Enzyme design. Structure first.
Site, mmCIF file in Angstrom:
data_model
loop_
_atom_site.group_PDB
_atom_site.id
_atom_site.type_symbol
_atom_site.label_atom_id
_atom_site.label_comp_id
_atom_site.label_asym_id
_atom_site.label_seq_id
_atom_site.Cartn_x
_atom_site.Cartn_y
_atom_site.Cartn_z
ATOM 1 N N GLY A 284 -9.901 10.724 -2.893
ATOM 2 C CA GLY A 284 -11.240 10.408 -3.330
ATOM 3 C C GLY A 284 -11.351 9.904 -4.751
ATOM 4 C CB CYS B 115 -9.734 5.155 -4.448
ATOM 5 S SG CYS B 115 -8.056 5.564 -3.895
ATOM 6 C CG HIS C 21 -8.653 1.553 0.051
ATOM 7 N ND1 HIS C 21 -9.279 2.779 0.090
ATOM 8 C CD2 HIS C 21 -7.944 1.531 -1.105
ATOM 9 C CE1 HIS C 21 -9.014 3.441 -1.019
ATOM 10 N NE2 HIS C 21 -8.197 2.711 -1.757
HETATM 11 C C1 LIG Z 1 -4.413 1.546 0.132
HETATM 12 N N1 LIG Z 1 -4.877 2.721 0.746
HETATM 13 C C2 LIG Z 1 -4.912 3.943 0.028
HETATM 14 C C3 LIG Z 1 -5.412 2.671 2.088
HETATM 15 C C4 LIG Z 1 -5.417 1.354 2.833
HETATM 16 C C5 LIG Z 1 -5.967 1.296 4.002
HETATM 17 C C6 LIG Z 1 -6.564 2.527 4.666
HETATM 18 C C7 LIG Z 1 -6.582 3.658 4.026
HETATM 19 O O1 LIG Z 1 -7.180 4.759 4.576
HETATM 20 C C8 LIG Z 1 -6.409 5.858 4.933
HETATM 21 C C9 LIG Z 1 -4.914 5.946 4.938
HETATM 22 N N2 LIG Z 1 -4.376 6.991 5.348
HETATM 23 C C10 LIG Z 1 -5.202 8.128 5.819
HETATM 24 N N3 LIG Z 1 -4.673 9.379 6.304
HETATM 25 C C11 LIG Z 1 -3.280 9.743 6.394
HETATM 26 C C12 LIG Z 1 -3.016 11.027 6.561
HETATM 27 C C13 LIG Z 1 -1.586 11.517 6.660
HETATM 28 C C14 LIG Z 1 -0.638 10.656 6.622
HETATM 29 C C15 LIG Z 1 -0.942 9.194 6.436
HETATM 30 O O2 LIG Z 1 0.077 8.322 6.323
HETATM 31 C C16 LIG Z 1 -2.163 8.771 6.292
HETATM 32 N N4 LIG Z 1 -6.479 8.039 5.807
HETATM 33 C C17 LIG Z 1 -7.088 6.848 5.356
HETATM 34 C C18 LIG Z 1 -5.980 3.741 2.609
#
Ligand SMILES: CN(C)c1cccc(Oc2cnc(Nc3cccc(O)c3)nc2)c1
Ligand SMILES: [Cl-]
Ligand SMILES: [Cl-]
Lengths: 306, 306
Positions: A143, A145, A41
């Site tokens: 960060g 991860c 991710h």
């Molecule tokens: C599995 N995992 C951790 C994952 C998967 C795919 C994209 C990914 O990247 C992100 C996800 N979320 C966000 N910002 C965010 C802020 C407030 C509320 C919200 O639900 C999300 N920024 C990047 C992580």
């Protein structure tokens, strides 16, 4: 004497930590030989978090889009591939600090050390147990991860966990080093059911043995029980069933203390049925289940297992 | 998120750990530059520990009586001398892995990571607090003497503790790296009184702030307290008195959470008087006092070291 949650020394793992950046996002990678491992991710943005198409996102990337930094030295990426939920970045240089190592998928109830990291730099080290429901309860901020979990036997580092996410419940989920999640979790920003959890019975018994070795004995009683009777109690209190294999693993602790395993089971049964009456065991006011029998012997090096 | 008892990454200290043997006594030493630091009671035989004359014992010792092993290599002792309760062995080879370091004498209530070692080999790492009575509740078995405690700030290792002995009560006593004991203890096999201990009140409040930051808020109330009135209850429960200095140190956590320091005290006042009624705070069924306000901010901020 004394009994403390004790992590493995982290030096050998520190030298493998690097920083991986793809466009916006930075997280940690693990550099072993000439391959860097990190969560896939890293190639994601918030636009993609609810249902990322990882194959398409990876197709848009090239080797030079993956910025990899080992301390102050930038690494040259000469290939990339996706295996399950991890990325493998081939670099032109083998990590000169690579320890002797293996990749292992641990069983629920086993413990490991976590080196929490941010931007490829280590922050702290602590012990986690893989819960029966295949979550862990750690300390993971934005960060973190790519921070890994591991065990050390003499000189071989067995990597068993890479951190990928925090569930809305505030517990943590991740993969083995082949990219396979522990439990039913997936790498998308979604509410996901973690199974019913349970208490790791064999670990509670090992910690009760550690307490006796350390002089805490108030919970010992004049009772005994059967494996079957005990397992009736365990199921009622949301404890994992106890198997003969577990009895077998507790043998050396039974031998050092002279307390038959099923006698200790009768002590545990009384603690579960009556509570602890405000008393403590090894400084704890609840029953601890994140020490394995192996963990206990390591800290009570008077018992004989070989 | 999540809050865990976290040790500093131990890599920089692992590279300084060696084995010191004098006759039939082996313990650990700390190799910085061309000096190996270790407890001076390494020169005592079994029958000498009741009241050793260390000056006379050291005089009788020769350089070649000290076998120093650093991994596969044995160092060559060319000098031996005594600084308070620490022995300093000059060796003909400087440690190429010597980190940037200081020697620091910490205050009661402060925390530090212990790298538990046996036979010169690091075994595990855990976080401790120096108790108000200058003991530490560690996990030390025979041969752990010479294991050190430390903090890291940026890239500098601040050594604050060397382990010397287990008191007959099973708690632990040691020195700073100049060899001065913490507390009233001496390096002779005698029954020694450790003073009355107290709970580190500023640390408990810091930990309560950590719980609020991690989503544990049930303990919060709308009660007001004066510092003087809170100290009346604290004294009844063997909590050390809270000062303005302590209030001041908790300021940043008060600012982050919107909970005034004295309002948190009002919260702790109720928890001491009524207990927890079976509820937990950050997984614990009792009040934790081995987290400093710094520790809490450091963790919840993701500070790293390089
Ligand atoms: C599995 N995992 C951790 C994952 C998967 C795919 C994209 C990914 O990247 C992100 C996800 N979320 C966000 N910002 C965010 C802020 C407030 C509320 C919200 O639900 C999300 N920024 C990047 C992580
Ligand atoms: Cl472990
Ligand atoms: Cl600390």
């Amino acid at each position: 004497s004394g009994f403390r949650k004790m992590a493995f020394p982290s030096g050998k793992v520190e030298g493998c930590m690097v920083q991986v950046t793809c466009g916006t996002t930075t997280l940690n990678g693990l550099w072993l030989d000439d391959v860097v491992y990190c969560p896939r991710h890293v190639i994601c943005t918030s636009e993609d978090m609810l249902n990322p198409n990882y194959e398409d996102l990876l197709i848009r990337k090239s080797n030079h889009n993956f910025l990899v930094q080992a301390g102050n030295v930038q690494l040259r990426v000469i290939g990339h591939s996706m295996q399950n939920c991890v990325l493998k970045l081939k670099v032109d240089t083998a990590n000169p600090k690579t320890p002797k190592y293996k990749f292992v998928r641990i069983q629920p109830g086993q413990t490991f050390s976590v080196l929490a990291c941010y931007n490829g730099s280590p922050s702290g080290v602590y012990q986690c147990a893989m819960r029966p429901n295949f979550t862990i309860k750690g300390s993971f901020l934005n960060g973190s991860c790519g921070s890994v979990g591991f065990n050390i036997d003499y000189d071989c580092v067995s990597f068993c966990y890479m951190h990928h996410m925090e569930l809305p419940t505030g517990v943590h989920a991740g993969t083995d080093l082949e990219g396979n999640f522990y439990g039913p979790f997936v790498d998308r920003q979604t509410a996901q059911a973690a199974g019913t959890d349970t208490t790791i019975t064999v670990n509670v018994l090992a910690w009760l043995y550690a307490a006796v070795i350390n002089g805490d004995r108030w919970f010992l009683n004049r009772f005994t029980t059967t494996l079957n009777d005990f397992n009736l109690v365990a199921m009622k209190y949301n404890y994992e069933p106890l198997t003969q294999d577990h009895v077998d693993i507790l043998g050396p602790l039974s031998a050092q203390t002279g307390i038959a395993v099923l006698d200790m089971c009768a002590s545990l049964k009384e603690l579960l049925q009556n509570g602890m009456n405000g008393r403590t065991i090894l400084g704890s006011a609840l029953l601890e289940d994140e020490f394995t029998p192996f963990d206990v012997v390591r800290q009570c090096s008077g018992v004989t297992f070989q």
